[PDB]
Design a protein around this ligand. Structure first.
Ligand SMILES: *[C@@H]1O[C@H](CO)[C@@H](O)[C@H](O)[C@H]1O
Ligand SMILES: *[C@@H]1O[C@H](CO)[C@@H](O)[C@H](O)[C@H]1O
Ligand SMILES: *[C@H]1C[C@](C)(N)C(O)(O)[C@H](C)O1
Ligand SMILES: *[C@H]1C[C@](C)(N)C(O)(O)[C@H](C)O1
Lengths: 7, 7
């Protein structure tokens, strides 16, 4: 991954 | 806020 969120 | 990221 490497991005974040939260969805 | 309350959401995340990262931008
Ligand atoms: C999500 O990423 C942030 C940034 O590194 C960190 O501070 C949180 O503990 C992690 O859940
Ligand atoms: C989200 O990320 C910030 C930055 O590291 C941190 O301060 C919060 O505790 C984490 O939930
Ligand atoms: C991350 C934060 C958020 C977008 N407010 C959420 O609580 O809805 C999600 C489930 O986790
Ligand atoms: C959160 C993750 C990311 C989008 N890959 C970033 O490193 O570019 C940003 C600065 O922090």
């Amino acid at each position: 991954x490497x991005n974040x969120x939260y969805x």
